[PDB]
Write a protein that binds this ligand. Sequence first.
Ligand SMILES: CCCCCCCCCCCCCCCCCC(=O)OC[C@H](COP(=O)(O)OC[C@H](N)C(=O)O)OC(=O)CCCCCCCCCCCCCCCCC
Ligand SMILES: CCCCCCCCCCCCCCCCCC(=O)OC[C@H](COP(=O)(O)OC[C@H](N)C(=O)O)OC(=O)CCCCCCCCCCCCCCCCC
Ligand SMILES: CCCCCCCCCCCCCCCCCC(=O)OC[C@H](COP(=O)(O)OC[C@H](N)C(=O)O)OC(=O)CCCCCCCCCCCCCCCCC
Ligand SMILES: Nc1ncnc2c1ncn2[C@@H]1O[C@H](COP(=O)(O)OP(=O)(O)OP(=O)(O)O)[C@@H](O)[C@H]1O
Ligand SMILES: *[C@@H]1O[C@H](CO)[C@@H](O[C@@H]2O[C@H](CO)[C@@H](O)[C@H](O)[C@H]2NC(C)=O)[C@H](O)[C@H]1NC(C)=O
Ligand SMILES: [K+]
Lengths: 331, 56, 50
Amino acid sequence: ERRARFVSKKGNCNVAHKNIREQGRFLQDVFTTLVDLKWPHTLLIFTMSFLCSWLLFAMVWWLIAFAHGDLAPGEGTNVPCVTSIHSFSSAFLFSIEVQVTIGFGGRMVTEECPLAILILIVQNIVGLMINAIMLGCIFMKTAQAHRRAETLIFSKHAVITLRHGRLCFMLRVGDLRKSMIISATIHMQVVRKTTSPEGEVVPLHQVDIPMENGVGGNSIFLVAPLIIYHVIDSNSPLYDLAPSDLHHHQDLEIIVILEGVVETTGITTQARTSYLADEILWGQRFVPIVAEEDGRYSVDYSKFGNTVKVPTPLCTARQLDEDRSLLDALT
Amino acid sequence: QDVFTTLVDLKWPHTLLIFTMSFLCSWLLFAMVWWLIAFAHGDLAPGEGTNVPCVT
Amino acid sequence: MPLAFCGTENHSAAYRVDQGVLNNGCFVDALNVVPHVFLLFITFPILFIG
Ligand SMILES: CCCCCCCCCCCCCCCCCC(=O)OC[C@H](COP(=O)(O)OC[C@H](N)C(=O)O)OC(=O)CCCCCCCCCCCCCCCCC
Ligand SMILES: CCCCCCCCCCCCCCCCCC(=O)OC[C@H](COP(=O)(O)OC[C@H](N)C(=O)O)OC(=O)CCCCCCCCCCCCCCCCC
Ligand SMILES: CCCCCCCCCCCCCCCCCC(=O)OC[C@H](COP(=O)(O)OC[C@H](N)C(=O)O)OC(=O)CCCCCCCCCCCCCCCCC
Ligand SMILES: Nc1ncnc2c1ncn2[C@@H]1O[C@H](COP(=O)(O)OP(=O)(O)OP(=O)(O)O)[C@@H](O)[C@H]1O
Ligand SMILES: *[C@@H]1O[C@H](CO)[C@@H](O[C@@H]2O[C@H](CO)[C@@H](O)[C@H](O)[C@H]2NC(C)=O)[C@H](O)[C@H]1NC(C)=O
Ligand SMILES: [K+]
């Protein structure tokens, strides 16, 4: 419609796949699919797995008792293989007791028939296997940290202002939790339908972008909010963005990828956000945020994304660097 | 939202208390359910009668 | 003389469920304890986390 976003502001992407030759890999990764599922759906499969297993073996216990004929009334002329089985519902309760390992012991397993002994072995092994598998799935779900990515907070929209003479595309990212993100990393990409002289056409060319770090690396130590900018050098594809060329249907998008292993669970998480063409404010520096109180600092997240207007030329970066060079040479 | 991550950040004393409270709350809540269902079933008043208790 | 939720007097016969269980004047009181012990034990784990 108006303009498709590659990744939504909340971090979820919007790309739609089509014409996939389903090889069953979606079904093949049973354990991975369970982890992805929501907790209500996980609990439904959890309940259905146990209930189906309990009911399946309950029918088997009823079947073996019916075949042995020990459920019909008897007077001392018989010894049932599973004691006190005089109804199907008794077999159902017996199945619960075995697999859950409750073992009330009112419905025992006698030494008489060997088939019930084999079925008891099978039910115990199957119960342990399913318990172990559900543990694994629950342990991977309780170790999920995608809900940690939500606590990572970016500015509502980014700016482009002059700093140290040159021009840079600024940005702010914040963390709300008290915990730390070990080995953090901020990638940054521009997504443009970039045409090439040789004749190629790319529907969405993803150009990587440096983080303008001190040592030219991707490492970032994120405790307070930081003005994470990108120096618009000659090679930067943002070198030719006219401020007059900032309107809606300008084919632009600034991906941001904040990575880093969460300290608590030890799981790595991504944070994503895309700045559109009309979501950029030219020449507006960010409001200072990190105040100081008595013996301690103070971050004012109320002013997290407020930007004040600062004067700057309304010229493309090419029209700025070239002009400055000519003036210096003439002088 | 991330209760699991929140639980990890808790100290061991508070984690033990929440561990204890979680088990105790489930145990006692279902104790009421078992008590109430038996009481409604009528197998709680003792006697040598025709009634057969649901939970002995 | 132990503790009884219903009345121990008259040989502890307030537990019979004849003529419907909703007519057992003690039982309706037990039905009124379920919602309260539900919220106590569904929010104490919630509150103690905070
Ligand atoms: C296994 C149950 C058997 C029957 C017994 C019923 C009695 C239940 C009480 C005891 C339950 C045990 C409590 C364990 C506490 C674990 C907490 C937990 O797992 O997270 C609480 C959950 C998480 O929801 P979420 O954040 O939306 O899910 C993750 C996210 N959406 C994601 O995609 O990562 O939040 C919830 O989800 C609420 C948890 C309450 C559990 C109630 C389960 C019944 C669900 C019925 C749903 C029917 C309709 C489903 C439609 C879903 C459509 C999407
Ligand atoms: C406090 C209980 C609230 C739920 C009551 C029952 C609701 C049934 C839900 C069934 C699905 C139908 C409607 C869905 C409602 C979803 C609720 C839900 O997700 O919140 C549960 C919470 C928080 O999760 P969230 O951040 O809101 O999730 C993402 C959300 N969807 C979003 O907007 O992004 O998740 C958490 O943060 C963890 C909550 C776990 C609660 C466990 C309580 C302790 C139980 C221990 C005793 C067991 C009692 C057993 C009784 C059995 C009786 C037979
Ligand atoms: C500045 C603090 C502000 C106040 C906030 C907390 C308040 C705590 C009060 C301070 C005194 C606490 C004394 C508790 C003594 C018993 C508990 C116990 O032995 O575990 C104590 C220790 C953990 O200590 P820590 O220094 O917190 O741990 C170091 C780490 N940096 C951390 O904090 O994490 O534990 C471990 O190192 C783990 C061992 C686990 C083994 C325990 C097994 C049995 C537990 C008991 C279960 C039965 C409970 C019975 C309840 C019955 C209810 C009816
Ligand atoms: N629509 C699709 N969905 C899923 N996988 C695909 C799809 N198209 C191609 N692939 C995968 O891409 C690889 C080969 O792609 P390509 O289309 O170039 O060759 P191909 O003729 O489909 O290959 P093959 O004979 O190995 O299936 C294979 O691993 C194939 O499974
Ligand atoms: C109290 O239970 C008794 C039955 O056990 C009933 O009434 C009692 O009848 C005996 C007769 O010897 C005496 O104990 C009293 O006359 C009654 N007991 C009382 C009034 O406490 C009756 O089922 C119950 N009482 C009432 C009022 O319902
Ligand atoms: K046991």
